[PDB]
Design a protein around this motif. Sequence first.
Motif, mmCIF file in Angstrom:
data_model
loop_
_atom_site.group_PDB
_atom_site.id
_atom_site.type_symbol
_atom_site.label_atom_id
_atom_site.label_comp_id
_atom_site.label_asym_id
_atom_site.label_seq_id
_atom_site.Cartn_x
_atom_site.Cartn_y
_atom_site.Cartn_z
ATOM 1 N N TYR A 1 -18.245 3.110 -9.627
ATOM 2 C CA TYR A 1 -17.681 4.373 -9.173
ATOM 3 C C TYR A 1 -17.793 4.624 -7.676
ATOM 4 C CZ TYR A 1 -22.023 6.912 -8.231
ATOM 5 O OH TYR A 1 -23.199 7.316 -7.701
ATOM 6 N N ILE A 2 -18.667 3.905 -6.977
ATOM 7 C CA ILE A 2 -18.850 4.083 -5.547
ATOM 8 C C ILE A 2 -17.608 3.700 -4.756
ATOM 9 C CG2 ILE A 2 -19.800 1.840 -4.891
ATOM 10 C CD1 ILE A 2 -21.400 5.145 -3.896
ATOM 11 N N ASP A 3 -16.847 2.724 -5.237
ATOM 12 C CA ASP A 3 -15.662 2.256 -4.546
ATOM 13 C C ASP A 3 -14.617 3.353 -4.400
ATOM 14 O OD1 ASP A 3 -16.554 -0.502 -4.201
ATOM 15 O OD2 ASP A 3 -16.141 -0.785 -6.344
ATOM 16 N N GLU A 4 -14.372 4.117 -5.455
ATOM 17 C CA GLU A 4 -13.396 5.194 -5.423
ATOM 18 C C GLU A 4 -13.853 6.366 -4.566
ATOM 19 O OE1 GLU A 4 -12.105 6.308 -9.331
ATOM 20 O OE2 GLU A 4 -10.171 7.064 -8.619
ATOM 21 N N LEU A 5 -15.124 6.745 -4.668
ATOM 22 C CA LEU A 5 -15.667 7.851 -3.901
ATOM 23 C C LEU A 5 -15.704 7.576 -2.406
ATOM 24 C CD1 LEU A 5 -16.872 10.725 -4.310
ATOM 25 C CD2 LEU A 5 -19.072 9.662 -4.261
ATOM 26 N N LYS A 6 -15.727 6.311 -1.994
ATOM 27 C CA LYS A 6 -15.762 5.952 -0.585
ATOM 28 C C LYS A 6 -14.542 6.473 0.158
ATOM 29 C CE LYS A 6 -17.092 1.688 0.485
ATOM 30 N NZ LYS A 6 -16.941 0.259 0.767
ATOM 31 N N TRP A 7 -13.361 6.293 -0.416
ATOM 32 C CA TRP A 7 -12.104 6.720 0.193
ATOM 33 C C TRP A 7 -11.697 8.147 -0.168
ATOM 34 C CZ3 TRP A 7 -10.629 3.160 3.714
ATOM 35 C CH2 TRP A 7 -11.038 1.829 3.532
ATOM 36 N N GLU A 8 -12.365 8.757 -1.143
ATOM 37 C CA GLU A 8 -12.079 10.111 -1.592
ATOM 38 C C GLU A 8 -12.846 11.167 -0.814
ATOM 39 O OE1 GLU A 8 -12.892 11.294 -5.802
ATOM 40 O OE2 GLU A 8 -10.759 11.808 -5.813
ATOM 41 N N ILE A 9 -14.140 10.945 -0.576
ATOM 42 C CA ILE A 9 -14.953 11.917 0.153
ATOM 43 C C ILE A 9 -14.522 12.039 1.614
ATOM 44 C CG2 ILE A 9 -16.808 10.321 0.891
ATOM 45 C CD1 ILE A 9 -18.737 12.617 -0.052
ATOM 46 N N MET A 10 -14.111 10.933 2.243
ATOM 47 C CA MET A 10 -13.705 10.945 3.649
ATOM 48 C C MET A 10 -12.405 11.716 3.866
ATOM 49 S SD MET A 10 -14.661 7.244 5.297
ATOM 50 C CE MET A 10 -13.760 7.581 6.833
ATOM 51 N N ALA B 1 -19.918 12.199 4.704
ATOM 52 C CA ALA B 1 -18.886 11.230 5.019
ATOM 53 C C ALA B 1 -19.147 10.424 6.304
ATOM 54 C CB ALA B 1 -17.555 11.977 5.096
ATOM 55 N N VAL C 1 -7.965 2.118 -6.063
ATOM 56 C CA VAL C 1 -8.094 1.570 -4.710
ATOM 57 C C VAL C 1 -8.395 0.071 -4.718
ATOM 58 C CG1 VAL C 1 -10.582 2.051 -4.456
ATOM 59 C CG2 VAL C 1 -9.076 2.018 -2.444
ATOM 60 N N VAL D 1 0.843 -1.190 0.000
ATOM 61 C CA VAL D 1 0.000 0.000 0.000
ATOM 62 C C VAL D 1 0.878 1.239 0.000
ATOM 63 C CG1 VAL D 1 -0.250 0.203 2.520
ATOM 64 C CG2 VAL D 1 -2.079 1.016 1.018
ATOM 65 N N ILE E 1 -5.788 7.189 2.083
ATOM 66 C CA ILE E 1 -6.350 6.398 1.008
ATOM 67 C C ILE E 1 -5.466 5.182 0.757
ATOM 68 C CG2 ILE E 1 -7.255 6.419 -1.312
ATOM 69 C CD1 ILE E 1 -6.416 9.736 -0.001
ATOM 70 N N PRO E 2 -5.996 3.953 0.807
ATOM 71 C CA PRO E 2 -5.200 2.759 0.581
ATOM 72 C C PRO E 2 -4.927 2.503 -0.900
ATOM 73 C CG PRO E 2 -7.413 2.087 1.101
ATOM 74 C CD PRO E 2 -7.358 3.591 1.145
ATOM 75 N N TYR E 3 -4.116 3.360 -1.507
ATOM 76 C CA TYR E 3 -3.767 3.211 -2.910
ATOM 77 C C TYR E 3 -2.900 1.976 -3.131
ATOM 78 C CZ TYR E 3 -5.724 7.747 -4.301
ATOM 79 O OH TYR E 3 -6.561 8.778 -4.583
ATOM 80 N N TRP F 1 -19.542 2.475 5.339
ATOM 81 C CA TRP F 1 -18.306 3.236 5.433
ATOM 82 C C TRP F 1 -17.273 2.510 6.293
ATOM 83 C CZ3 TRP F 1 -18.643 7.295 2.107
ATOM 84 C CH2 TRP F 1 -19.925 7.769 1.774
ATOM 85 N N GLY G 1 0.080 4.357 1.078
ATOM 86 C CA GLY G 1 -0.043 4.922 2.414
ATOM 87 C C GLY G 1 -1.336 4.500 3.086
ATOM 88 N N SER G 2 -1.225 3.896 4.263
ATOM 89 C CA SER G 2 -2.379 3.469 5.053
ATOM 90 C C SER G 2 -1.889 3.007 6.426
ATOM 91 C CB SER G 2 -3.145 2.351 4.317
ATOM 92 O OG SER G 2 -4.416 2.146 4.906
ATOM 93 N N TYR H 1 -16.652 11.811 -12.137
ATOM 94 C CA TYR H 1 -17.055 10.457 -12.467
ATOM 95 C C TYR H 1 -18.000 10.373 -13.662
ATOM 96 C CZ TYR H 1 -14.953 9.457 -7.894
ATOM 97 O OH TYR H 1 -14.123 9.347 -6.835
ATOM 98 N N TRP I 1 -19.829 16.503 -6.661
ATOM 99 C CA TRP I 1 -18.957 15.364 -6.395
ATOM 100 C C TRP I 1 -18.944 14.289 -7.469
ATOM 101 C CZ3 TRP I 1 -15.321 14.751 -2.614
ATOM 102 C CH2 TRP I 1 -15.328 15.664 -1.565
#
Lengths: 88, 90, 127, 56, 26, 101, 168, 102, 119, 144, 50
Positions: free
Chosen positions: J25-34, H7, D43, A61, J93-95, F9, A63-64, H95, H91
């Motif tokens: 697209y929901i997967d990417e936005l999950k870690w981006e919005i937070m 969030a 991700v 990873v 973000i776990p890239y 989440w 960063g995490s 996308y 947002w």
Amino acid sequence: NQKVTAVQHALRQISLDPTMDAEKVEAVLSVLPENFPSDALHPHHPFRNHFGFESSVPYGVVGSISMGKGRKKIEKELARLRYPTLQR
Amino acid sequence: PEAPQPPAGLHWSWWELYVKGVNPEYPPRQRMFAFLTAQGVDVLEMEIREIEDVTRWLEMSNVYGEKFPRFPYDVTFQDKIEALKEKYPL
Amino acid sequence: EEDDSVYRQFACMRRVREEPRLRTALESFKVASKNATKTRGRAWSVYEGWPPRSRVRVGDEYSKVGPLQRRAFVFNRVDGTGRRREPTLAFCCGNKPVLLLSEAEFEALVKKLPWIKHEMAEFKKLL
Amino acid sequence: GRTFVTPLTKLQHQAALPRSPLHARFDFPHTVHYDVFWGPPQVEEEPNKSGCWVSF
Amino acid sequence: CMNKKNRLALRKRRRRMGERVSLRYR
Amino acid sequence: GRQMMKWYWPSKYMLQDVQMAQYFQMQAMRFAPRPAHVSLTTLSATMEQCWKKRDAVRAFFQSIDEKVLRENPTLQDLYGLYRTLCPDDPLRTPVDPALWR
Amino acid sequence: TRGFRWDLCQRGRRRWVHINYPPRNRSTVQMLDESHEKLVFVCNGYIDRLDPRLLPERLRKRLERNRKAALTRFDGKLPWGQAVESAIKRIHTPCLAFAQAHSHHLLEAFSMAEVLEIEKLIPEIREAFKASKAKLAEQEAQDKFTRHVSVDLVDLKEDPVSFPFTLK
Amino acid sequence: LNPPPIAFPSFNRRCQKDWLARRAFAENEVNGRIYKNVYQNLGFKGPIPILNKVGQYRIRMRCISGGYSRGIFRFTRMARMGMLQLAREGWLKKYGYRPGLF
Amino acid sequence: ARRVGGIGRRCFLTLHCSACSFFFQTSDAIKLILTQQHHILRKKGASKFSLLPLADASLLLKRRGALVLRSLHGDPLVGSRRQRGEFAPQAPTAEMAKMLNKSCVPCPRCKREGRWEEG
Amino acid sequence: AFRYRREGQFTKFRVHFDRSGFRPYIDELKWEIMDWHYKRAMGPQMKKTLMSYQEGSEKLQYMHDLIALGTAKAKFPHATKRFFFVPALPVTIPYRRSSNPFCLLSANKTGWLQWSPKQRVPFPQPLGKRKVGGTDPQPPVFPK
Amino acid sequence: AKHRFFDPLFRRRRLSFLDRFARERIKGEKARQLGAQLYVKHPDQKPVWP
RNA sequence: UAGACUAGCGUUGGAGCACAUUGUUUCAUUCGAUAGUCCACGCUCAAUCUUACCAUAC
RNA sequence: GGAAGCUGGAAGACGGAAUCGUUAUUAAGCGCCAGGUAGUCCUGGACACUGAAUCC
RNA sequence: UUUUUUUUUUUUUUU
RNA sequence: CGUAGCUGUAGAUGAAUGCUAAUUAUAGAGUAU
RNA sequence: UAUUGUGUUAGCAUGGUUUCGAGAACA
RNA sequence: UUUUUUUUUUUUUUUUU
């Protein structure tokens, strides 16, 4: 690194204690993995071909909370094998 | 004040900080690290889902006391410790 | 393309070319497997060496076919994890709907035995 | 008890591998195709990106 | 498939696959 | 099993703390060197050993025919490295066909 | 909004002796707290049996064909006692049973005559426990290895791609 | 006044209960196939009461920015109001979301 | 107009035979194997002999016999309502052909070993 | 017949979600919005603490370098500036460590990234008068 | 120096209770007793954090 | 100058969901009242969970 | 809960009165699936073919 | 095509 | 693809499809006539 | 990688967002 | 295409021994 290691370890049998009189020519040709069977590589899995080669694909990873993870205990085994099996 | 981080290759490892509980400042995790380390288990190479599962039992059995180790199918807390040790020797 | 003039003149390369049969390889695997898994291999050892259900006292335990009883009933019950060991006393008929567990419960029955004996007489016997 | 040999392991034992890059294993033309995913750091891994087939 | 439209479609579909289903009522 | 887990989440009580003590340590160790040389160290201090026994290894190839050169990983590499110290060394009439060397 | 299971709407295994679960004049329970299972209580019993001898020629032929046969038919008994209650014999006898602590379910009941027989056999049943303890050690060694696991391949594993091989 | 911070959802007991069943089924997913294999080999159909509390069908769709268990799609994973607020806050433009088309 | 097989005269229920010339639908396959049970049992060499009564020719035409044949034949052409579009049923002859050939059932036309095929 | 105007009709109403080229697209936005909220709350706070003690800030950094490497490689005389502290924040973000040589984060050897002290183009651009949620610490008040 | 991150939704809620703590009137003894253990101390200065 | 007229064409029965009168220890809290934020309401699907209700107990 | 075989003497040829509205690839018929994360509707969403008339 | 066929048509594509 | 065209039957006074001793499929469980 | 109570009186006549019903946009 | 690490009831959760 793996070319020099084979060559360096082979010079031990070539140094004198012209020809070899065909008596000790096989000694230098027996301490290398090329002309050696792959059956003794693992006593727990007696077979001809079991092990493959490792890849150079980046892992981990960026960063995490799990930066210092790398590969799992079970994942490292398959990283050095051609493909997984179900014989164990 | 703070311990060093000598990982392999790089010079920073967030995984060791979380398991040790130094960065998160979680008292429940800080006491858990000193307990499993004495038992002889490789906690540094454990899954994220398993570390929290064991830590939950340690706190639950502490506040309420060591009097309710009940588990489904008649399982004792000692069985999990022994089973995990084999998979993670030292 | 393979040259057979070199392998015949060297023994080291001959081994690699030679392919041992599966029979020879399988023989070695059996020895290695048993050595590693020394504490494994047997699962069901409560085979007829002691016949399941019970062996100490059998026949005419709880079958309500005649007055009075003849003998008792004792055996072992496997735990849910397969490691614990406890005895058993209760046996109705094969299914055993009610289990008395180990002697921990049977001990209380003897202590309470005289209490119920003196109570049943004055409970509904005289009415 | 029985100790049989799995079909996958049997194929591994019987396989004539090449001795170094300069030796031709096969003796007929063949084309190898495989799809490789490249892009920004995602991700999650994209599925259906491990296909391999040979044509002749 | 409750009405006569959707229900009859299933019988007609099977007729084109190499089967014979009675038709008649419904 | 892994499909249903991808919901809701993630946790919020496991984020990295903004500690000033760890900030200084990261900056101090950022300018560290890279004295790895894992591959260079192996090759280094090795050419001298071959030069010492140059005469001993000179007769190795004389008694070995070209057709016998089946193990290239150990033989092809050795031949190439040997020629580096001695550019001119005619052993016999037969030579490589500009393919193996 | 239908029911979950249809098994609850059917009669389970026969209890042999029929006892009214809801008490009316039951005493107070005592002890049976630490165990928290199989509480002891006193109640009233009611025995019942059927002897197919006094039945008429019409109904006896059909009843026997269903009871004494290769397989059971219609539970091997007639319907509710609309007309067979005359041949039904039942004798009242005080009895007791056990119930679950939290679940509060009936397990079984025992007759008063059988209860007294247990007391007279105390010496005979007590000595039987000694025989079980003898086999406790023997079964411990055989039941411990009842766990099949895959053979471990890693062996604190090597990196055996090509080198190392001289290291071995 | 102040639209919610999308969030971090608020507290909800029912929402948390749904996620609890997901973990139980994942660990017991292996045992589910074993129960079906033994019956198939013997040739007998029987019930599996143990699967009632750890079954896959016990879990249902739920709103992440919510806690209602209806009106949630597999593409957006949000309710009627969840999508409206997310789309109006700017947002989804990155996308590929063009509201010009009907 | 209302032909069987559609425009392309589809046939996803018949199986051809390599020897001779004779075809039948999957409906008759169940009856053929049951009727010729004596030959199959003797070929290999009570719980095993459970379907002996079903070998009767007249019993199959009775009410009891009609239900037994329908129970085995599950009507594979019929399926769920969601199986629409690309998710359409295919020819089930692949499974039937394997069983018919492995059981070594003689053909009504000519007495022969396993010679059936998909078609 | 309009061909280009009707493009994508087939894969809109006669295609399955799992049998199409459309990716989630929901997967990417999950870690981006937070992660957006993390940089907003901890952004100004980190800078305030760094600027709290103007002088004597470089002494701590200089002493730390004497323990890790021992010899101060970046040593300079008293008449030269040492360094400029930049307020950075950790990555949440776990890239995935992809093998893309042209990536901007695949070659990251540290768990800290620079933060822009000023931005002229806000990413969360509203489509109207609506404000951004979670940007009102002080509670409201009514005339009453 | 330590600065623990907290949920943005909790920040506004903290000020809501504190604003009316010493300014307005709060009824009920339980509300004051339970409310004096979550918003009385800063998240970073707490002894234990969930 | 819309509705009004001129064509086509669906209904006073038997059936699915829902509101309501009559049952209920529980039969889902409810919208809107007459041209409709009223009948598949936030039922884009209720055979367990979704379910807030009653009974039982920790 | 959905569909199917067999069986079939469930209640209907009442009314040319009356109330719901269509700005023509409108109206009237017929046929197909996409989602609803096992099955599970006669409603809603969505595509295609035949396609008349009037003073609007 | 006078040794040629032996036939109804759909809602993305020969870039 | 459906009403096709075409072409056999009764140029239906009698084509209404619900009721059910009983099986097909999904599901851990949808059972009794 | 779950974690800061309440699916409870009180919205037409004091409410933030959304919206049904009626009316309007010209020099 | 390769067959084995040890083992006591009619009473295999239905029979008056």
